[PDB]
Design an enzyme around this catalytic site. Structure first.
Site, PDB file in Angstrom:
ATOM      1  N   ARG A  39       0.830  -1.202   0.000  1.00 12.12           N
ATOM      2  CA  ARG A  39       0.000   0.000   0.000  1.00 12.12           C
ATOM      3  C   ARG A  39       0.869   1.258   0.000  1.00 12.12           C
ATOM      4  O   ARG A  39       0.603   2.213  -0.740  1.00 12.12           O
ATOM      5  CB  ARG A  39      -0.913   0.030   1.237  1.00 12.12           C
ATOM      6  CG  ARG A  39      -2.174  -0.874   1.298  1.00 12.12           C
ATOM      7  CD  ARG A  39      -3.227  -0.548   0.274  1.00 12.12           C
ATOM      8  NE  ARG A  39      -2.776  -1.066  -1.018  1.00 12.12           N
ATOM      9  CZ  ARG A  39      -2.490  -2.359  -1.274  1.00 12.12           C
ATOM     10  NH1 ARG A  39      -2.638  -3.282  -0.305  1.00 12.12           N
ATOM     11  NH2 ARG A  39      -2.075  -2.746  -2.505  1.00 12.12           N
ATOM     12  N   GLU A 184     -14.782 -15.157   8.863  1.00  8.44           N
ATOM     13  CA  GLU A 184     -14.696 -14.620   7.516  1.00  8.44           C
ATOM     14  C   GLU A 184     -14.390 -15.716   6.521  1.00  8.44           C
ATOM     15  O   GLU A 184     -13.306 -16.080   6.424  1.00  8.44           O
ATOM     16  CB  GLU A 184     -13.688 -13.511   7.433  1.00  8.44           C
ATOM     17  CG  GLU A 184     -13.500 -13.034   6.051  1.00  8.44           C
ATOM     18  CD  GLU A 184     -12.463 -11.961   5.957  1.00  8.44           C
ATOM     19  OE1 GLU A 184     -12.280 -11.484   4.967  1.00  8.44           O
ATOM     20  OE2 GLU A 184     -11.791 -11.730   6.870  1.00  8.44           O
ATOM     21  N   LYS A 226     -18.376 -12.106   8.310  1.00  9.86           N
ATOM     22  CA  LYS A 226     -17.889 -11.136   7.323  1.00  9.86           C
ATOM     23  C   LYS A 226     -17.758 -11.930   6.039  1.00  9.86           C
ATOM     24  O   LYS A 226     -16.724 -12.577   5.770  1.00  9.86           O
ATOM     25  CB  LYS A 226     -16.551 -10.550   7.755  1.00  9.86           C
ATOM     26  CG  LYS A 226     -15.962  -9.436   6.914  1.00  9.86           C
ATOM     27  CD  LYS A 226     -14.664  -8.756   7.644  1.00  9.86           C
ATOM     28  CE  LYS A 226     -13.668  -8.056   6.638  1.00  9.86           C
ATOM     29  NZ  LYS A 226     -12.351  -7.660   7.277  1.00  9.86           N
ATOM     30  N   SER A 268     -15.246  -5.596   1.523  1.00 13.11           N
ATOM     31  CA  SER A 268     -15.435  -4.872   0.258  1.00 13.11           C
ATOM     32  C   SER A 268     -14.794  -5.610  -0.898  1.00 13.11           C
ATOM     33  O   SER A 268     -15.252  -5.517  -2.029  1.00 13.11           O
ATOM     34  CB  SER A 268     -14.868  -3.445   0.373  1.00 13.11           C
ATOM     35  OG  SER A 268     -13.533  -3.388   0.816  1.00 13.11           O
ATOM     36  N   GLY A 269     -13.740  -6.332  -0.633  1.00 13.43           N
ATOM     37  CA  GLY A 269     -13.096  -7.204  -1.578  1.00 13.43           C
ATOM     38  C   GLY A 269     -13.011  -6.763  -3.015  1.00 13.43           C
ATOM     39  O   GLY A 269     -13.590  -7.374  -3.916  1.00 13.43           O
ATOM     40  N   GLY A 270     -12.215  -5.748  -3.258  1.00 12.10           N
ATOM     41  CA  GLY A 270     -11.891  -5.266  -4.606  1.00 12.10           C
ATOM     42  C   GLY A 270     -12.861  -4.251  -5.187  1.00 12.10           C
ATOM     43  O   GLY A 270     -12.604  -3.703  -6.264  1.00 12.10           O
ATOM     44  N   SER A 297     -17.339  -4.212   7.069  1.00 12.82           N
ATOM     45  CA  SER A 297     -16.014  -4.368   7.706  1.00 12.82           C
ATOM     46  C   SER A 297     -14.997  -4.117   6.599  1.00 12.82           C
ATOM     47  O   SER A 297     -14.488  -5.038   5.967  1.00 12.82           O
ATOM     48  CB  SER A 297     -15.807  -5.731   8.333  1.00 12.82           C
ATOM     49  OG  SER A 297     -14.439  -5.807   8.755  1.00 12.82           O
ATOM     50  N   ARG A 300      -9.627  -1.809   2.540  1.00 10.70           N
ATOM     51  CA  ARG A 300      -9.285  -0.981   1.394  1.00 10.70           C
ATOM     52  C   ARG A 300     -10.357   0.078   1.119  1.00 10.70           C
ATOM     53  O   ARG A 300     -10.030   1.253   0.894  1.00 10.70           O
ATOM     54  CB  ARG A 300      -9.084  -1.891   0.184  1.00 10.70           C
ATOM     55  CG  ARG A 300      -7.671  -2.414   0.030  1.00 10.70           C
ATOM     56  CD  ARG A 300      -6.809  -1.417  -0.848  1.00 10.70           C
ATOM     57  NE  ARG A 300      -6.392  -1.996  -2.150  1.00 10.70           N
ATOM     58  CZ  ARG A 300      -5.978  -1.284  -3.201  1.00 10.70           C
ATOM     59  NH1 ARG A 300      -5.934   0.057  -3.096  1.00 10.70           N
ATOM     60  NH2 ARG A 300      -5.591  -1.904  -4.333  1.00 10.70           N
TER      61      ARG A 300
END
Lengths: 358, 353, 358, 353
Positions: A39, A184, A226, A268-270, A297, A300
């Site tokens: 990041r 998750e 999640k 959110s995964g991408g 949750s 990014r």
């Protein structure tokens, strides 16, 4: 022979309700060293412990408009034991702003032999002692990430079973030691599969998970889930409405997640910062009956603007902080169904945040 | 494929080496806390050197032991220790025709929600560990799960979780060239009779082999390490060596695929001499037995040695001959040729919990 | 709480050992009406009860050189209650020749919803009463056929599980009522898959089966298994040796079939009369350790010559009968490893006997 | 896909019709051997006409019952019987707004190797049967499995086999346009307390929903028919209607997906009036309950009717008003609006085995 006493079940359950109280969600600042490095490189910053402390510091000390947005915050082990500029331990910074502190306990994915590149996760060794310790030190919840992939013969029976088991061992150990587990089972968005395939696979996975949790005598009212939203794959040529994603998603959940689960905090995964909030909003507006909290949750998808604004430079502190707040407010309204976009979605907040998990 | 023809052959080769005819295993892998109680019983202090000396006693015994001992299971600490003459302990072992094994589990942990039942932990980073252990001389490995017969135990959760960690453990091992000894221990604690043990034994092995199938384990490159099938320690009804044998051999005929290369029994509490006697009754059973039936014994090769040693350097030879006779008796017991005791060789080794 | 007494287990086990005593095998004459019809049409014969009685009669009364070849014989319900020309009930004809009588109890395959054309089998309703009855009437063993298919996403988890369950219910009910069950999980040879794929799938199936049998408390010493050999698919372009088939097959069995199983009586499943005996012989010559009887339970592959010789015409009785005997002798020597072909393999005995199970 | 959008919608439609607000089900599907014991208790002979007359009593009761009864479960024989006025019994039912259901299981059978536990049979040819039943007026179906709490029961084999036959049964039904009522009955026999029932109830529902997932069942086109969660019949400790309610509603919150369209409880032995009272406490629980919680009652709608009938044609009206009051009390109980008995309405209906 019960696992938990009446008081132990009240504690776990109270903790779980405070984290998804109406309008609140989870900020996931729990990237490992090797992960947060990718990041900071992308804004030209050396990945030093001190830049790590500084960037975490930026998110946890943003102004008090985030307090009603942020019910919990997940930190990595390093961060949990760092301190702000004024000397206050980060645990206490988040507590003083009204958020439960949480701690990432897994130790990363390992390969499952005889499969097409599937994984399970490791991290159970010594986990009960680590949890007691994290509890002393301020953590009231835990996170563990399992990864499955949609593809040619995947997720396979072995990987659905094994992942679901280990998420069951992890949750048993957390509850024994005072900590709400976040379960998750992330199914990756990689691939060209359509929406209905991601629904199907997600429904098969979450059912294996909640059987395993039952087999391991896990107290569901003191857990959270999640999962991924039900979406078409990254490479899917075909196009799907945000309401089609809310239908696939709420329907997958209504078919598998028992109502006693206190809430579902989506990864959110991408998804871009904006797609994440629009799809979370669409889901909370779906008129079908949904007996659990449906919030976020987001890692990014709460931090992309903040991180490009900050750029690495101390003097953008307040301008970074504000992009993050703007997102915490977006997603608090989304997790209530009240988010209508400004039409002005920033480029950073429209950028896809996907990364092939190769 | 989990493995290539070349990896599979190296595992079949090792597994067969260990359990060759007339050979069994020396289970010398006591943790530092559990070798403490064996040393406390002989007045010796629990110091790194006194464990080193005791382990050297057992490893450097005389060449009569070489055809008896195909493999030696070692604890981490001992893998990196050396004999007086400078040699590392694995080279001592290989020099006498023994394959070196390494215990790699990190003990039991409670399973919430059950009556006192456990799993076994130790999977974290196991791949790197094995990779290194194989570089430092070890070619097989060991992992113990522990189940107990009680009014509601071994439960379904218990049986299923311990069969699943065994299989994980075995899969990791085999990807690193390490033969896994799979150890589902049914403890002798309690007052159940033989039939109960037999029922539980069958039920646990069926769950083990199923889990190993699901995880794609190459069974020719495994060893099974099961309890014999015996009454509970506190059972009042009594049973002959022929009954124990029949029932143990039946239970394994009904659950263990012929492809498994060897069955290396744990002693579980039996006297040095009952363990030998039973192993012989098992191998003399006229029924058909498609796998080697041999020993992976810790206490039933070590109890007389330890007493004869006493902590006293001068007793080395005496204590080394005590090991060598039980090693020799089991070499014959695992061929049906042991036709024999002494007080230390007749003493119950049962401990609780 | 046991299922069986000591005496009940001795009976079941004796029955199972008499059927695969060295050199003996199973003749499967258990085709249903709708199935045997397709056999008689192909030699231009009306499918009348009387031609059915006559053809069965031809096989069960062949000369006494078959007696040491034929340890059991499986009949359909109709046949079990027919009588030879001299008035003796067919059960007793086979008994008087030294073979155990057996009875087909399943009621055919049904579709499994939500799968790619997979099936389970039905036939459990009233089965315990049917078995007691069949036992009174001379049957000492039973047969039930489950069918799985290698293909695109098949056999699926659901179909491996469900088939294996029901084969477990069937076997529990037979044993309770005195009858040895033959457990037949047939994986079809249809398709272009190679040999190692049929090994893999067979190993996964037979392990599900012997877990299920354990879960249902089935007495393995009083059971038999009738699986498919491990072969490449019918359409597989690639070529495989008969010793490669014996290696794949014996290896699949050594990895899954516990030694307490009294024997394995292979189905011929589309193999020619000659290929069936050569591959059965090759298997019994494989030097690897095999702790169970390895013989045959052949239907088509014992009857092809006999049926073309008979043609429908009463005056070929003795010429048909002899082709069948010639086969029973071939396969008795094969089930001992002593079969060396005459080089003169009849055209009928070289013809593929496959039929797409579409 | 098991089903098309059009088939799925027809099942969601029926399931919702049955369990509409203030509606429940009349479980009138007694086999001819078990309606024999209900008739023997009132001196009436077990003849085809006397069952026809009794069934007509219940079906032709007055229109006050129509908003109470969304579905009527019928036994085969009664599906093909007619009212005095010529109408077939299903048309009588539909004429009053009731959906017609058909019981299609063929009873229990012992499971070898267990302590007296059973499966349920009836799958053979079930597809053709349903196809025909749907042509003759039936739109839902019923299948009962039976488990019992004992020292070693319901075992793992029991739970797993009965969840698997339920799912098979439900899959067949749904391919033929028939809404399946899934019935995993935990019997009240024995002296266990409430917690035990609750534990077992949860454990069985988790296994049921898992099996239904594995078999690809459309849960929106199912109904669940579970026991309330109550102490054993022979339990000495006593419990309030609020405790029963909490525990039943907890157990179903932890195991039943919100997608299931309705929960239609069996009475299980409770008096007509305890069944109504409990159903009301369940619906008044402040916790969230994402599915309808209603009644599919046989004996708890029929016990007063049967007594008041006595076998005597002149008692028809009297016995029909007895059915209509319990139908009306449950219509309110399944909305939390029942605030009330009589001897026949207070009598235990518990039978053993």
């Amino acid at each position: 022979y019960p696992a938990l006493t009446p008081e132990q079940k009240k504690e776990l359950s109270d903790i779980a309700h405070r984290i998804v109280a109406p309008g609140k969600g989870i900020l996931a600042a729990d990237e490992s060293t090797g992960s947060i490095a990718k990041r900071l490189q992308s804004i030209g910053t050396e990945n030093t412990e001190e830049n790590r402390r500084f960037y975490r510091q930026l998110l946890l000390t943003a102004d008090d408009r985030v307090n009603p947005c942020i019910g919990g915050v997940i930190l990595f082990h390093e961060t949990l034991y760092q301190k702000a500029d004024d000397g206050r331990p980060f645990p206490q910074v988040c507590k003083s702003k009204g958020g439960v502190v949480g701690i990432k306990v897994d130790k990363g994915v390992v390969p499952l032999a005889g499969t097409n590149g599937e994984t399970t996760t490791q991290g159970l060794d010594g986990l009960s002692e680590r949890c007691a310790q994290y509890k002393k030190d301020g953590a009231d919840f835990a996170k563990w990430r399992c990864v499955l992939k949609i593809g040619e013969h995947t997720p396979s029976a072995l990987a659905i079973m094994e992942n679901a088991n280990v998420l069951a061992r992890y949750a048993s150990i957390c509850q024994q030691n005072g900590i709400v587990p976040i379960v998750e089972p992330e199914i990756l968005p990689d691939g060209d599969h359509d929406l209905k395939r991601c629904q199907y696979v997600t429904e098969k996975v979450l059912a294996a998970v909640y059987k395993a949790l039952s087999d391991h005598h896990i107290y569901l009212e003191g857990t959270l889930l999640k999962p991924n939203m039900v979406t078409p794959g990254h490479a899917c040529t075909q196009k799907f409405s945000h309401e089609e994603i809310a239908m696939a998603t709420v329907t997958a959940l209504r078919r598998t997640v028992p109502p006693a689960v206190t809430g579902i905090t989506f990864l959110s995964g991408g998804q871009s910062e904006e797609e994440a909030s629009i799809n979370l909003n669409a889901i909370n507006k779906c008129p079908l009956l949904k007996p659990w909290a449906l919030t976020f949750s987001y890692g990014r998808a709460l931090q992309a603007s903040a991180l490009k604004a900050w750029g690495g430079k101390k003097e953008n502190l307040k301008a970074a902080q504000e992009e993050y707040v703007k997102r915490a407010l977006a997603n608090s309204l989304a997790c209530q169904g009240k988010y209508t976009p400004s039409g002005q979605a920033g480029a950073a907040a429209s950028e896809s945040l996907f990364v092939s998990n190769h």
